């Protein structure tokens, strides 16, 4: 549930069990180390190895909150790809997951071509906006020069 700042401060109370033994605790901290550098695929290839009980009710949520983030990266200005890029990047040669992200996300299959629109805003600017507050700041300059003697 994305308590990554709460994750590492939780690890203070474990003196030496992380290194010596304790694969029950060693597996999620090896998991978080796989999330560190760039290694998405080692997470999903260690999916078929839990030494503990099934852990499935957490790791279904854990990978779902990974998938939407990479979906959140591809719902940016990255305009169009094919299903084979959704096979490479996202995963899974055809299940109904392509139906899952057709209804949750957009990604309509056109003439063997997906579509993702531009999420870039217009950036409205004036850049003389602080004309009131800059006129405020100079007032308390002279207010703190005079008036307090």
């Amino acid at each position: 549930q994305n308590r990554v700042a709460e994750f590492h401060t939780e690890l203070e109370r474990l003196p030496a069990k992380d290194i010596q033994t304790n694969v029950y605790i060693k597996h999620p901290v090896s998991l978080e180390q796989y999330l560190m550098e760039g290694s998405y695929n080692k997470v999903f290839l260690a999916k078929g190895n839990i030494p503990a009980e099934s852990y499935t009710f957490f790791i279904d949520i854990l990978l779902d909150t990974i998938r939407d983030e990479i979906a959140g990266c591809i719902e940016k200005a990255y305009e169009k790809i094919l299903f084979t890029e959704a096979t490479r990047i996202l995963f899974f040669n055809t299940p109904k997951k392509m139906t899952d992200y057709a209804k949750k996300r957009g990604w309509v299959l056109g003439p063997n071509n997906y579509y993702s629109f531009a999420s870039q805003q217009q950036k409205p600017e004036d850049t003389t906006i602080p004309s009131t507050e800059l006129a405020k700041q100079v007032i308390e300059y002279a207010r703190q020069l005079e008036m307090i003697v």
Binding site: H8, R13, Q33, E37, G38, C73, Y78, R88
Partner: protein, 480 residues
Amino acid sequence: PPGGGEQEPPPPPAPQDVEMKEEAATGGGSTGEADGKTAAAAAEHSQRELDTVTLEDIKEHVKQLEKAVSGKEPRFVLRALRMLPSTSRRLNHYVLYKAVQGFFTSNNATRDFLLPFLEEPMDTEADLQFRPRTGKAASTPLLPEVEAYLQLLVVIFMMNSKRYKEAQKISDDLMQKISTQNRRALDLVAAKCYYYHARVYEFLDKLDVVRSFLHARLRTATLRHDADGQATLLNLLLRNYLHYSLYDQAEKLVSKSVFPEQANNNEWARYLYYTGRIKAIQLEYSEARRTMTNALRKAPQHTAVGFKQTVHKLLIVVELLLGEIPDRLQFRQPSLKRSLMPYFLLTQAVRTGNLAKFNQVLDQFGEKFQADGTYTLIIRLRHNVIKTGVRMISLSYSRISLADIAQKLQLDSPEDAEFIVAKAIRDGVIEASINHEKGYVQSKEMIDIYSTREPQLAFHQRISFCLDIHNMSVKAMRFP
């Protein structure tokens, strides 16, 4: 005795004279400002406090036989000073007993009779109006009582004699300190007792009972008002919870008492050391390394002290968690020779792309990492082992292809190198963008409106800081 016994007459008498006139001038001048000019912050209170840290701890540890500090306990065993005849008769007792102890041998306590020689100082018609005199001249014999370092059955005498003082300390807080406000002295009195009371509860069971007291002690501080009281007790309360290797840091995250607001250049420097370590463990690296920088450059005025080498110790780690590193061993010491070799050789392996050396020197110098309390680098700096080069490349190059950064980061794969670049821009390591159309990774734009729009947002603080110097100058100007 012909060799050392003939060199026994020189050590007493000048410490019987000039070290005696130290607290005679201190106790006289503190009384003089407690009576008139009741705002008594500017006196020898500060310099004696700098002396009681430095001078009288190393002026004497033992009670300095042939009656230099050995005489101090039968000297001050008879202190009334109650009415004007009881002052003038004790002023005769300041004449007679210092003449006897300067001549002959008075009642020598044999290191265990010091506590009955702390009874008749509290007894023998002692006063409540001379509450600096009771507070200072009871706490100042506690440092020979603790720095005797024998630590056997005097530890409970440490425990008794501090709670003797702290019962007087709390009762002074209950009995209404009229126009003196000993808190300016009682803050570091509450520190110096609880530095070694923390040691005592390291030599025995835990010191959460101190924290339950210190919570109530921080409560009666600053509800009255703060005069260095919130500043000292907060770093005392924060240190145990940081010393405990339990969870303990989200307790400090919700600790909303972050205003000491002035600290006389000494509490604030170490306060920024503690909270810099706290913001480093919840992975906020940018705000941590700049307030760790602020703590290092604020109070370094020592001679190779070590905690300066400890704030310099943690500062290089978080900068290796963001890539840059300066010259570190350019101020080498006889003790820094021990502590330069792991960290200088650590960033040696970080700058190069070698990980086998990085794992070797972890194995080589992990036990030195155990003494420094920094195990966590191996799990969180292997992130920046791959991220240092991509920070270095994206600062050098301007519009790079992802097919070439794979061999330059020696990753041998362009398909995941998109994701490392995606993670770094997600973390805000580099501000650059990616063209996912033909494989371009271009950097940012040129030097921006920095010449035009920014600089007043630096200028506003410098106006406000310098006129407050002008304000704090003018307000504290005229005492006569």
